Each structure stands twice: as structure tokens, then as C-alpha cells.
Design a protein around this ligand. Sequence first.
Ligand SMILES: [NH3+]Cc1ccc(Oc2ccccc2)cc1
Ligand SMILES: [NH3+]Cc1ccc(Oc2ccccc2)cc1
Lengths: 642, 645
Amino acid sequence: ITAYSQQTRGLLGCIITSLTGRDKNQVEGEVQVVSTATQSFLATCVNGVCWTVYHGAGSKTLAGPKGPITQMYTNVDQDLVGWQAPPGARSLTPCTCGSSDLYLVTRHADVIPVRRRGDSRGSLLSPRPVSYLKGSSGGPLLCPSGHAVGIFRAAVCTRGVAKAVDFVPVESMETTMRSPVFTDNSSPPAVPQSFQVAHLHAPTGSGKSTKVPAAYAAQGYKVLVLNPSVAATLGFGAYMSKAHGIDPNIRTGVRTITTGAPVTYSTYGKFLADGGCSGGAYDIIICDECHSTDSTTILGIGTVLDQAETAGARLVVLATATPPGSVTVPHPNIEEVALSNTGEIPFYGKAIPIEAIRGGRHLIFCHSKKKCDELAAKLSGLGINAVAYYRGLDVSVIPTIGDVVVVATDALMTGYTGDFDSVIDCNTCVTQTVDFSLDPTFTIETTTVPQDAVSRSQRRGRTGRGRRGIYRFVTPGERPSGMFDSSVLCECYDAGCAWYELTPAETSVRLRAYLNTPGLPVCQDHLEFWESVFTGLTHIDAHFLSQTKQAGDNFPYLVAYQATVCARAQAPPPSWDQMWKCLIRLKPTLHGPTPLLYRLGAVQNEVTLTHPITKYIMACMSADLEVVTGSVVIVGRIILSS
Amino acid sequence: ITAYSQQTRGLLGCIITSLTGRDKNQVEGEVQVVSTATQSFLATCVNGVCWTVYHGAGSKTLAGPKGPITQMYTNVDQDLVGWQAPPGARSLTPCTCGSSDLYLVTRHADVIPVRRRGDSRGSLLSPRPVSYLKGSSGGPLLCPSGHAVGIFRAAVCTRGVAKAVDFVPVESMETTMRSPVFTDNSSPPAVPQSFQVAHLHAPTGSGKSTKVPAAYAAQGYKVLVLNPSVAATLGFGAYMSKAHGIDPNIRTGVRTITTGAPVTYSTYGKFLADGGCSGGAYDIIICDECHSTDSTTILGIGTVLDQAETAGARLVVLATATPPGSVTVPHPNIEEVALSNTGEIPFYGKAIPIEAIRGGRHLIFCHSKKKCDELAAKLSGLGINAVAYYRGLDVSVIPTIGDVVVVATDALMTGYTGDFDSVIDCNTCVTQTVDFSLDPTFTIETTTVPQDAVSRSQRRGRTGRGRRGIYRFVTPGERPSGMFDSSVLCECYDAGCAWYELTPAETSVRLRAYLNTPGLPVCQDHLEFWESVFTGLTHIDAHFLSQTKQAGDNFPYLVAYQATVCARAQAPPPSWDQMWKCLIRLKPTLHGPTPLLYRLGAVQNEVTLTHPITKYIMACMSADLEVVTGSVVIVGRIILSGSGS
Ligand SMILES: [NH3+]Cc1ccc(Oc2ccccc2)cc1
Ligand SMILES: [NH3+]Cc1ccc(Oc2ccccc2)cc1
């Protein structure tokens, strides 16, 4: 095998084409170089279908001769997407009698030897920088005969040096093609003779966590319905007593009720607080909002999947309006309008007319609490009745009746259950992103990022509920949905220690149940990495753990454990911002360099690396780490020949 | 003082506008959010001129009502460029009485208080990560009265936190405006009565390395001519003695010759090897190729500027075809032709058709030695006589001579002096950047990047000499010339130690003479930081040093030092790349994590940061590092409050 690249489009055409969705150039070759507005990567044609990775492609359409091609196949559990191949596309053909010597075509037309180990794993003969492979997701792994063993999806790395490759085997495509491209998941499953995890995809309003649990209980089953939101968990209790004459049990941290009833409503949080499943309690477990990628939902859903075959249950139901890989589609009840630039109120580069929000009840989403208070002032300045809500504030700041503009962060989603005449969306959210920076260990950065399609649908779906709604937006983009960052896993272990007395090895078992169930959000497999680092975080100071839970910002356990080590060395904290207020009382006492374990923010101090734990963590970094490496547009192609 | 922002264009409207260079949208506001294809930053309109930083904007035009607006001012030393505001556009105005309370406006429309601490420095009352200030270059510092104090150009960092901001004081802008738009520099200067550093910007052709040094000799003056290339130096000498009559002294490593003549030709390397200026020696020194930013040319010119006046010289001419700021205009003699896809030979995305090169003499440039070899092999299949040249190989591996298609890296432009019928350029080169990654110390990465204007001009310069010439290219456009990376300073200290027995403190002085002389290539000033690093690198192993020196590769002193520490820890090197070949010999006896000092490449062994040297370098990192933080298109604006705070 031999290979060379050919650039077919430059920037302007790629943009123009992305928007029009009309690729008029004739698709020659069988490996294409593709681009989105942000990423560039490779797509291979096998068996008449043009394949690539989900983390690159998303749910995006392919620009084609007659306009946008929607995806024919979308397996988010195998990081696989595929479009029907435009007429005149050559295709590689599968590999019958696999060799072990493979050849990985990169986007620079370099052909890289690979030794096959697993079904989906290959080891690079000559290890290379991970940077080298980035751009080559969805490039084909070949055998010498030129046939197609699979498509590349991740590097497996030691300390930033790719030594193995992760690929999608060609049979997983053959499975994928064979799978029902449309499956029906709107009606609730019947209660099978033995254990079975089932899915329920139904829009909000289908009674997923009211009608259906009522159905199961009328059939005589004892039913637990798990939910992220306390406001929601509590709200069902009341709706039930009314519209189905069951006073159900309610279990929330704040306030629980045990009527004896066959149906229980519970927060995932409280579920975990009570040691998961009690054997004999329930026949059916409904996990609502399982598209949720907060640590408590993940850990909770993990637990249910881990425990319920044993606790006697016969049916787990993963219920959601927006499963991984789903596209934000028109709602028949919600007019969607773009914010423009002629309005009285600046809002994320655009403007809001004061007409649009004077009188009525409106919801303006912002990414940050700073920007909320800023906007809630501006509006009160203009005589509009504005109110900020975010993590911290109590939900009574939101008047339940009467005109108001609520400027909120996403906290609003789990904190408040009402709906609104309009919603204005800045179309962006803050997120936490772990970086294996080796300076000395890992870092957790905050970042404003484009909203994913799940968020857009949660946000927009706060208007239009059985009554008409306007949804105003700054921008039409979604990022693709149902993927989460490794830092979410990190948060689970932190949570496991902080709140639910779980040893890191028990958290792992539950996360591993989550990861190995198809149809959930996906995540690079870093369970062992994180387990190992938390394994080493021993003899924490209870009193510091206390104050970081109390204050309730993220990573209370890591923040406490740094805090701890800092105190066992009269050594000051990384910095004197809020995070390390739990030390203010010792400020004039501490002096020297900070014994740094990891970066959870700006470090403003001398730092020594010579602490035994820091070293343990650095040794944890030598772990194998799987890393990843408008329409999608074809910008170029790689031509194959040994 | 408060602010908010308006996005006035999308991503497509912005590409269309960069290419056409025509923007109709009224220019409202004072602070403009401008953008290139590659990046984005701020531009502030002051006294009717629309200013921004050179590092963002280069020499690019600015889209406007009737078409691209040409830069009125360009000061690559201040990092400052300016276009005439289209009539309409509001302007800020300067401060009328230095109040020290200041206010920086960021591209996120945040306004962040700054305490003025000198002519063009202010400290953040609240330190913040540098990443927060990125894309705010060209933004204004305002006094409390809302007047322009300066345009922000860089953050001063400790370990990635901005504690202070550097700006272009609006008085510098005042000078610039009250001054000529066009300057001469085209003609050789007359010799002054006392010391003076003149510039000379003239085409290769103006004989600035032969004609003008003759002229000065004809007037009875001793002139020394420094050049980076050793081929260029011997060739100028030869030409002189012959077509000019004076047998000139040559001073190069490969060939030294003392006639006694009044003209001496030399490379920068030999000059530096000879200890620089020997008192009395010369009156005029011509630094040809001052635009070069090889460590040797930078150290050499630094020495000349540091020593030339005390050595009794009267005139240093900094000589160059392409000074910082210069743009690639066309040629009378060179038709330039977009390479394209339809062609028998693949070449960086496009193809080269054979007919184009089947007969005659051709230079094909390639970003790397690998691609040269690979492309040689391919051209000797289709049966064209094609050599590959590059660093390592010998100059005479090229026919002088027959039919040929030479496939070269930039090494060509110092080794060889001949020209060609057509030149094919992939338009990209290989740089080194230093990243202060604190992992544990710093990284020197070798990257591939778009070529700058000088590069394009040199590469295209190898045709169209006194005849027709075709220029084929993979990509139009250049990045801006006259800026070099912090790694190049690193190379300078490294050569200082490796080659020229200069201690770091001595080197600082030479380089500081370079930096503070204006009209040369500019540079993030990291002198004290590197000086510190190399001061701590003591008791290097002479034998490793001599092997890395011989080897020809980069950072010989750093590679050999890293090797020294390893050998003496009986630890293996960070990899078994070619870079570490000097330790292969010893491979059996080397066990354990490597005691890592810095990163020059892929670390593969386990590492360990307990070495005293690691810690020393780690401490050096707490230094104060200044970090930078088609037409330019206005894509938005920041609006400032007219009253109140
Ligand atoms: N950036 C987060 C991210 C990126 C890629 C990704 O792909 C996967 C991972 C695991 C299984 C299947 C697909 C998951 C999460
Ligand atoms: N005030 C001197 C000055 C002028 C320009 C300059 O631009 C650069 C240089 C190097 C890298 C990035 C930008 C740096 C320093």
C-alpha cells in the first residue's frame, strides 16, 4: 500500500457548501477528507456506505449532489455514522481472512503499520506523538491485500505518545447496517418473563413518568421512578394524588414521604444516599432523563443497572425525549426566531427588543451567573421586572405568578418546574474539561462552549407546553449530543467519596455498568485511571470535606484533599480565590511552595512537586488513556496505491 | 466605564469580505473587533486612524466601502499598524493629563482595571489567566475620562498568569502620525562623521553586497561585508576580484584569505568565531541579509551593533531586500501560476504536470528532507534527472550544468547560489516554537507553518534573473515578515555556549543591542529568562557537546546537556530518536526514569523531576514572560458607556 492526498476545496467553498448542503463535485476515491466548521477528519467508503466517526460527524448531514444527505446509520455506542454513498463512489470491500499486519492510512497520506490485538485494537510498531494522528479519525485500517479491516477512532496513549489504535471493526458496520434503521420506542415495554433493560423514547408530555408508571401499577407492579430534579420529583407526588388517585411515596434529600403506595418517586441523589436498591422493593425501575450527563444521574443509573437484576426487578426502563444522536427538530407549538442586532438590550453580541419582554413571563438563559446578574440589573434599570436565578439562590426568587423576566443558568432546569411565554437562549454553556497536562498531573478547566442539541431542546422546551411559545436564539448551531467529558467521570468518583460513602472500586463497577449498556451517553473509557488516583487520596481531613460540601462547588473531594495536604505542610493554597476560603482562617500562618496534586484553577504560588501523593498521581498518569483523534463537506481525498 | 459588544458579521460574510476587501457596513463605535482567516483581535480608532497590532494584522489591507484600505502606518518595532478610518467612523482621542488609573477593554466587552506603572506598562489590580486576555490585542487602555491611553499588545506572565499588561502608548501613535508616510532607505548612505546605523533597502541587483562596498572602498574606506551564506560570501568575493579588480580578504570557515585589501568579506559565523570587531579594523560594516533570523545572523549583527562604535567604525549599514513589514509585489520577469489538481505528480494537495518540468532547469521546494527524497524517487521514475538537496548533503551533488530538476529545502538558499527557469513552492516551512508548558519546564516543538513574505520572496527569487521565469505555487498569501520566535533567542544562547565561547551575560549584551536597534526583526523580549536558564547549565560534558556540534542538529548545547545529566545518572534519554544517538553506545548500562530538564521532542521513557537542574530551570520559569495575547475584516464592535463609570 501507498497513498497520496488531493485537496479539492479551499476555505470559501467549504463554508458556502456547508450552508447550502450542495456538493456538486464528483466523489472519486474511497477515502475522503471531510470538514465541519471546526473539525477536519477522514471518511471511508465500505460496502456502498460512506463511514466515519460520530465524535467528528455528529448527527450532521453530508453535502451532496442534490442537497444535504441525512445519515442512514448512526451508532453512537460504536462512534459510527454513515451516509448512503453518492453515485460514482468506489468502495473498499471488507476483509474476510484478516491478517494481523494492518496499515493505517492517516490524513497526511502516511501509511502506518499496525499489529492487531483485539477485535478493535491495534498496536503501532513505531510509537508516535498523539498529535501526529489527530485529524485521522475515520481513516481506514487496511490489510495488505488493500481490503478494509475497520475505521480508526482513538489512539491509546502513554504520557502523550500513541502506542495503540482503537478502531471500529468492519463487522460492527455489517451489524449496524442490518439493525433496524427505524425502531419504535414510544410505547412502554411489557414486563418480560425475566430481566431486561429497555428504552423509552417519548417527547415530554407522553406521561413517561406519570401515565406509564400508573399503567404498570394498575397491572399490579411495584414501580420506582428515578429523576434528577427535586422540584420535579416532588411535583409528581402532587400531580399523582390528583390525576391518578395514588398518593405515591416521595424520596428527596430535602423531604421524603412513605405512604406505603406501590409507586415511589425519587431523585437519583436520594436513591444513592440510601445504598441503591433494596432487594424486593421494586419490579420496574424507570430512569427518567437518562440523557442527563451529570455525575449523580450517571452514578445513579449505573447503580440501577448494576444492582436491579439482583434486587428482584424484571424491568429497567431508560426513558428520555432526547437519546444520544438525536436532532433538534421543529416543534409544532413553538415559533423559533433569530435574535437580530436592532434591539434595546445587548445580549451575547445580538440584541433584544424591549417590546419582546415587557409584560408576560419570559426566560433568558445565560451561561454564567455573572452575566445573569449583570442582565437582571440592566432590565430592572429599565423598569422591567427581572430576576436572576442560578446555583446558590433559592427558587422563591422566581415569582410563581405575574410578569417577570427570569435570567437563569441551567441550574433552573433542576430547580424550578414552571413554563414560560417565551424563551431567549444565548446558545452556549459552561463545561468542565480535564486536560492531561502533566504540569504536574491533570487540570480541570472551565470553558464556554456551544450548546449541544440536548441542551437546546431542554432550554427551548420551557416554552410551548400545551400553549404557544416563542424561542429566540443567538445562533442556530447544535454540537452533537450524548457524549460527555472524562471530567464527568472524575466528578462521579469525587461524588462517590464526598457524599455516598462509595470506595472508588465500587464507583467503578457502577460506572462500568453505565458504559457497557447501549443507548446511553458515551464517554472515553477512563474508569481505571480515575479509580487509581482516588484510590491514593487517603486520610482526607473530615473538617475540610465538610466546608467544601457546605459551599458546594465542584470537586469537593479534590478541593478538600489539596486543602488537606496544604495544611499538613503549613503550605499555602494554589491561590486565595473562593475555592480556598476554607483556609482563610490560617492565611497569615502558612508560607512556602504549594504541594500541588493537580490544577483545579489558576495557581498563583510557588509550587513544589516533591510530595509523595503528587508523585503517586504522576505515576497514575502513565496509564493507557484512550483519546480521540450546517453540513459536513468533502474538502479532499486520499488515493491508495504493497 | 462599561462596555458591550455587537457582532456585525457572520463567518461567511467575513470570508466574502476578506477576499473582495469591500465592506459597506457603516463603521460605528471606536473599538472594532477585527478578524483574519487565522485569528481575531481588536482594532481601536484613534485620531482618525484605525490602529491595531502588527502581530495580528501583518501588512494586510483592511476591507472598506470602496475596496481594500492600505496601511497608512506600519511600525513593526512598536508592534503597531494603522489604516485611515473610513469617513464616518468615530474615534477615541488621547488623554490630556496622565491619571494613573486605567481601564483595559477586553474583546469580551469586559473592562478590567489597570495601574499605570511606567511608560507602557500597567499592572492588573486583579491577576487573571492569560487565556482570558486572548484576542484582545489592539484594544484600548482608557483613562477614567474615556480617553485613549494606549493600545494593548501583550501580557506579562508568571507561570501563565497575567500580572501586568504592555501597551503601545498613544504618544508613540502621535509621533507616527506627525511624520512621513514614505521614507527613502533605497540608496547607500554617505559615511557620517561619527557613528551611525543606517538602513539600506534595495533589490538583489542593487549590488549592495558588491557594488556599494566597492563604492565605499573607491572613496578610500575599509569596509567589512557580513553575509549569512558561505556560498554567497565566496561568490561575492570572486566576482569582486574579477569584475572589479580588488582581491578582497575572505573570512569563512571553509576558506580564509588575507590579501591586505581594504574590503573584507565574511560570514557572520566566522566574524563571531574571530571574536567580532577588532579595534581599528574597519570603518564601514555592511550587514547584508539583516532580515535573516538564524541565530548566527542575529548574534552577529548584535555583536556588530554592540561593538562597532567602540572599535572605531563610522557606519553600520543594515542591508536587505525585504525589511520587516515588506510585502510580495509582483515581478517584471516572473509569471506566477497557481499549481492545481490536474497533473501527473502529486504535490502538497495539488499536482505538478510533467510537461511543466520535463526539460530544462527547475527547483522544487519542499518543507522537509523526507518529502524531498520521496519526490526525488518519484521524478526518477518518470525519468527526469532530479536530485534532492538538503542540510547534510553536499552542494556539488547538483549539476551546474546538465538538465536537472532540483528538489530542495531552504538549505538550498545558503549552500547553492545558482538560479533556475522555474521554481515550484509548496509555500510552507518548518519552524520551532517554544511552549512554556511547565511540564516540567518548556518545550521546543518543530512545526510546519505557512511561509512568511521573506520566504516567498527568497524562494521565488531563485528565478527571473535577467530573463523569463515561471513561479508555480501551492498556496497564495503569506504570513507577515519581521517576527521571530523566542526559540530563536534560545538558539542564540545555545550557539554562544556551543560555538563561540560566549557566556550568557555576554550574549545578553549582544542581543540586547539587536533588540534596541530599530528596523530589525522583532521579538518577544525573553533575554533575562534564557540568560538565566543557560547560566545554570554548568559542567556540561565536552565529548557530548562535540558530537552534537558535529552532528549539525539544533540546540546542540541543550541536547548535549540533557545527555550529560543522563549519562551521569546512568539514566536513558527521553527517547531513542536520532537526537540521542550520542548515548546509543551506552544503551546497555542506562536504566530508570530520565532526569528530564526540558522537552525537545517526544519523551518516551518514564521521567523524574528531582534533578537539581530540573528544579533550577523550573524556578527560572517564575520569570516575567511577555506573551502575545485577504484583508482584515471588521466582524463586530465593542460599545463604551458615554457617561457614568
Ligand atoms: N470528548 C468526549 C468524547 C469523545 C468521543 C467519544 O466517543 C466514544 C467513546 C466511547 C465509546 C463510543 C464512542 C466519547 C466521548
Ligand atoms: N515591542 C517589541 C515587539 C514588537 C513586535 C513583536 O511581535 C511579535 C514577536 C514575536 C512573536 C509574536 C509577536 C514583539 C515584540
